[PDB]
Amino acid sequence: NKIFISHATPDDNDFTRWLALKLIGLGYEVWCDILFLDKGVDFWSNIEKVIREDTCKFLLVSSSYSNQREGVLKELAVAAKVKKQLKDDKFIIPLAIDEQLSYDDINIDIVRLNAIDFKMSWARGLKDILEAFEKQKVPKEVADASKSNLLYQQIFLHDKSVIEKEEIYDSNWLSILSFPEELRFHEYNWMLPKRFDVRELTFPAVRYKNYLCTFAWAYDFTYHLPKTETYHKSKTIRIPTEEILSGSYDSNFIRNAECKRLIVQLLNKAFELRMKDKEVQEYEMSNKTAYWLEKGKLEKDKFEKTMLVGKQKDKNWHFAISGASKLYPFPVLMISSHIFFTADGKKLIDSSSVQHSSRRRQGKNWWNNTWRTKLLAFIKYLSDDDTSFYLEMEEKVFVSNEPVKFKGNVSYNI
């Protein structure tokens, strides 16, 4: 009571899978060589046994690939012998699915047979198949799409699922491992307009009501503020940073959120000054600043054999990273990758549109491994010792050069 479908194995797979699953969902027993994920030792002998003893119809997928295929022709001959044995005229029902194969180029075996046309429409062909099966009293069961869904899950999806396996991912977050012992509010009063530039000082300082929120010493500002030479350490509000990071400060003097924001501002300013001190080029974006390198500054632009500068078509592309600092959820430095383009080795392009177009063109063929390796190479380049890198804050802030690793319990099989 089976239904045998003969086809070219790797070429007519889409239509064969579609038709086999549709027929299975309609209550028919379908025998197709793609409906068996694991193949036994006896294939051809079992195929001949199936044709001779089991099938009641023989659907042939007549296409250009299946016109002169040895296996298809052998099955056709065996099916013709079986049709002669059972005295059934309509045992073999070819299905014309290929428009490249003319109706006059079909082989001898099915040149005399009434075919079913699938060229113009697959739905019309399926309706014709069902009508012919109903008219010829082909045995069938009750319709049940659950069988088709189960077969589709078992055979066509078993190697495309999620496997349970440990996986390790590298992020773009550099955890801040060490913090200064405490924060200092320096009540310098006037201090000659309190260094009106503020942002131009050697050490990171911000202007509070009448104080100066710094992490370094008061005399460090004597270079830019001579008056601060006579400034006294008695006008210093000590505040414990480790207690601030736990949200312990209260009262109306200053809020915990304000302290965290001020710390973030100090960290970002200090990072900017350190990057300026590292002799790297700066690019101004719409809302941030990125740091990039030049053509020949590395020998030979292969830091750790990862490449940082390259040649796209006619312009030199340079990798870059842009940074920030956040306390949410825990103190981290957060960096993002960028690609910049220069006409020459040491130059720049003022046209933003061409930069955007070139960046989009280059992003198409980089992928996760190159992205991660270039990010890690840049971070290691910025490093200052074995497993960290420091930034001026006497006092200083150390940020790890190894991004925090995440661990997952699921993965795939490439």
Binding site: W18, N368, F406, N409, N413
Partner: protein, 469 residues
Amino acid sequence: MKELIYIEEPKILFAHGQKCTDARDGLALFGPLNNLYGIKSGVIGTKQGLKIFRDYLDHIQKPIYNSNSITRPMFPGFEAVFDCKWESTGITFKEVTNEDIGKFLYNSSTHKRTYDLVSLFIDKIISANKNEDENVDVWFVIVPDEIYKYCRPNSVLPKEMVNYDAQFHDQFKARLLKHTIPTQIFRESTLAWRDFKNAFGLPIRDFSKIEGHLAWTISTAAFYKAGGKPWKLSDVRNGVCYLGLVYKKVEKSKNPRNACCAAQMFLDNGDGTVFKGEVGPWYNPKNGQYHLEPKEAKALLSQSLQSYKEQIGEYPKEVFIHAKTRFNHQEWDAFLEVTPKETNLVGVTISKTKPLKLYKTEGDYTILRGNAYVVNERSAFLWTVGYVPKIQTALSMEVPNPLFIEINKGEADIKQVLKDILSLTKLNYNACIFADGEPVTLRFADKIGEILTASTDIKTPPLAFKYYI
């Protein structure tokens, strides 16, 4: 040294009550939930546009293949999928002459030219709707590429050939709302991408390897607009209503205002899905402020609860609000003054502005989709975009960005919130793809808001989505 939890991919339901993970595979296997008899299409455009549409409609009946049938499933033809006839014999043409387009297109003012072209198309559409006997399910507007190029808000017309929003699509869909006409806008370079080539002798847009994907998306959109149900959610709870809140700046108004628009998602008593926009964009007059006033918030929640009660008959057990912003104290206080004590209010903020990129160290592929990094009991990251084992490829292009999901207000299990968001990423009827990144509530509320803020004013707008998407 942190642990990522995995959220199983949600399953969507198709005809015969069969669950599947892929919309395309389920449609090609079982079929849609609805039973459309056929789609009668009206076509507006030039004779060349009508020929292009007829050729594409005849092409879409035959099976269409992609470059790879595992990464991208192939289209087996419209009637072989949706079980309904969408042929070129049911086409009701309405010709727009090229001189008509030439008269209005070439103008110094972009606003005037956009208004004139939109009026030229919509007047013919409306007259055919009212003064004809033929029944049209979807009106297909085949816009020439020059109109699309020169009708954008920032488009500038070169001097060689020289209220409402200066955008063809938004103005076209907003000025057609009073008549409730589901329409689909095509560009001539989309349906006939072969013929529109650049100076290099090659097509500007290459659909050679994604022809089946284009057919899938077009067929799904046309089937949904005609009144069909392609699929629905299968593993969602009962008695829970999902909302969405998107703010859009209104520029036609003399005073800049922020209009808040909503989309509402829940289930009815017949196990079906009810997914429609909550509209009447509530206006905040203060520029730069994206928070509703207490009376507007009360009206919004009252309307949502009234719609839920009129649909089901009982007040929802839970109400989830998804937004890209953060609710303040006044908004939530107004919200609680209307909702009953038996209803739990949860306000979730969904954002994509936190740059946490995870790189896999053992290949060229990206992190699996569905992995979540729970920061704490009120904050987590979700990877809605990433590598999908079924399609053997990632939904991103270089490295996906995470969705930062934080329960801003109320009490809820963050795992359940992540499950809900991942499930909602499977309800995009505008396209036939795998799951997308944004939740469908936020995306469709944004889609509604883009249209409701492209006109001076409008009466009570329709809730159905076929008039917007």
